[PDB]
């Protein structure tokens, strides 16, 4: 008999994810079906999104050889029925206060920082780069969380050293680039570019660096279709482009500039978006989402 979610203490709420205490050394990591676009959590959930992204994360944890926070199988009896397939039993870690970002391509705040200064997070780059330019080698572009409604703040390596220690900063940098490089090559082989990604790490009782959070999901990473990769223009979001096009199109009645909360999505846009998530998962994992556990 699976426990009720109400049996666990709620310890943290993020935009799309929830964290619960299971016991002194374990947490329940829960992905929801909520989707964010243009820095708004939208009214309309994407069916099965939490399950698909959990399946994705589990695949990539298994692909990477590095220590990670998983503490049980996806059907672990400590997982409540209501979140089965979109929740994981994980080891509680002392989390390091660094958003560990790898960028293989130049976009978003990385591109903006470069266009303003010629550098990103302390990396002085060649002249002549632009939107969706390939970055080789990939860059470690760490960030720190800001206030509730604010974007993360890009910082340089010295800032990371001041947060976690010199040797630990080195370790974060090296592991971030190593696992990004592996996952990105794997995805591209299957026709998907992982343009960038954001990791969080924690430390266990033995002082070991442990990969936590979710890894290489379309929420933590920019997914692009490789078949349409065209440097110099903004790449479509593999998963979210239908959502973005509808919100900013003539049928939504919404003005992006207004900063007013956007309206709910058409059901058919939500279902199409679910299909994109499944396609990305199945292409990258080589597995069938129909085999992934659920309620
Ligand atoms: N993910 C995650 C996490 C957060 N806080 C503490 N431990 C963890 N494994």
């Amino acid at each position: 008999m699976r426990p009720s979610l109400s049996d666990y203490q709620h310890v943290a709420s993020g935009k799309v994810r929830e964290l619960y205490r299971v016991d002194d050394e374990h947490l329940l990591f829960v992905a929801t079906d909520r989707i964010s676009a243009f820095d708004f959590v939208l009214d309309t959930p994407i069916p099965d999104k939490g399950r698909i992204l959990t399946a994705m994360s589990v695949f990539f944890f298994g692909l990477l050889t590095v220590p990670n926070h998983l503490a049980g199988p996806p059907d672990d009896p400590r997982i409540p029925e209501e979140v089965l397939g979109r929740a994981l039993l994980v080891r509680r870690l002392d989390m390091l206060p660094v958003e560990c970002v790898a960028r293989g391509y130049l976009t978003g705040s990385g591109l903006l920082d470069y266009q303003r200064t010629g550098a990103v997070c302390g990396h002085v780059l060649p002249q002549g780069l632009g939107e969706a330019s390939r970055l080789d080698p990939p860059l470690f572009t760490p960030a720190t969380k800001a206030d509730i409604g604010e974007h993360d703040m890009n910082v340089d390596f010295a800032a990371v050293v001041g947060l976690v220690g010199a040797v630990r900063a080195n370790q974060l940098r090296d592991e971030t680039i190593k696992i990004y490089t592996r996952a990105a090559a794997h995805a591209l082989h299957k026709g998907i570019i992982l343009a960038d990604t954001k990791f969080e790490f924690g430390v266990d009782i033995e002082g070991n660096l442990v990969l936590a959070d979710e890894v290489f999901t379309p929420d933590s990473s920019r997914y692009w279709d490789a078949a349409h990769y065209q440097p110099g223009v903004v790449q479509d979001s593999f998963d979210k482009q239908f959502v973005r096009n509808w919100l900013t199109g003539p049928e939504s009645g919404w003005d992006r500039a207004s900063d007013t909360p956007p309206p709910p999505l058409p059901d058919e846009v939500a279902v199409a978006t679910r299909e994109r998530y499944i396609e990305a998962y199945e292409r990258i994992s080589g597995l069938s989402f129909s085999d992934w556990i659920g309620p």
Side-chain angles (χ1 to χ4, degrees), residues 22-24 26-33 35-38 40-144 146 149 152-177 179-204 207-255 257-259 261-274 276-280:
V22 173
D23 57 33
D24 287 340
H26 301 85
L27 309 174
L28 186 75
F29 188 102
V30 180
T32 72
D33 295 334
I35 182 169
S36 183
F38 308 118
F40 292 101
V41 180
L42 310 182
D43 294 348
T44 309
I46 306 304
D48 295 309
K49 174 172 175 286
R51 286 176 58 237
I52 303 157
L53 270 59
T54 297
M56 296 174 107
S57 195
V58 165
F59 169 76
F60 276 109
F61 276 131
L63 179 77
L64 305 171
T65 57
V66 305
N68 68 54
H69 71 162
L70 301 181
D75 65 349
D76 192 292
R78 290 169 299 180
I79 302 169
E81 191 73 38
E82 83 165 272
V83 292
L84 196 58
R86 62 181 178 91
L88 300 169
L89 223 294
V90 303
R91 302 189 266 151
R92 180 181 54 83
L93 303 168
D94 290 335
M95 298 300 295
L96 298 169
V98 183
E99 305 309 304
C100 290
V101 178
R103 301 182 186 263
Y105 301 76
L106 192 63
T107 192
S109 71
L111 177 66
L112 183 55
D113 288 358
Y114 170 79
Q115 292 171 326
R116 290 173 171 171
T117 70
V120 187
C121 297
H123 297 96
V124 178
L125 303 183
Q127 291 188 338
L129 305 173
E131 177 67 62
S133 284
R134 176 70 185 256
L135 301 167
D136 199 18
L139 301 181
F140 181 58
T141 61
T144 53
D152 294 352
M153 168 172 121
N154 292 339
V155 303
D156 63 8
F157 185 72
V160 180
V161 171
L163 281 162
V164 302
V167 170
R168 184 76 76 190
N170 287 337
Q171 190 184 18
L172 288 179
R173 173 169 61 190
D174 290 342
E175 182 164 344
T176 292
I177 298 302
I179 68 180
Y180 169 77
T181 297
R182 175 78 164 96
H186 173 93
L188 176 55
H189 189 68
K190 303 283 203 287
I192 291 168
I193 289 170
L194 299 178
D196 52 40
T197 201
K198 177 174 297 184
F199 307 126
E200 287 187 313
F201 295 89
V203 183
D204 61 19
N208 295 326
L209 188 64
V210 180
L211 184 61
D213 207 58
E214 73 193 45
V215 296
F216 298 107
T217 71
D219 281 352
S220 75
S221 321
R222 283 182 177 91
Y223 278 49
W224 296 341
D225 190 347
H228 296 295
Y229 172 50
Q230 176 192 339
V233 301
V234 174
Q235 306 306 285
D236 286 354
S237 166
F238 190 92
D239 52 305
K240 300 187 177 73
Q241 201 59 41
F242 303 144
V243 164
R244 288 174 29 201
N245 289 348
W246 184 83
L247 281 177
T248 63
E251 298 202 10
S252 72
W254 184 63
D255 174 25
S258 74
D259 221 23
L265 303 170
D267 279 354
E268 66 188 2
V269 168
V271 170
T273 298
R274 173 186 182 268
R276 287 302 262 183
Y277 285 127
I278 293 175
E279 180 183 351

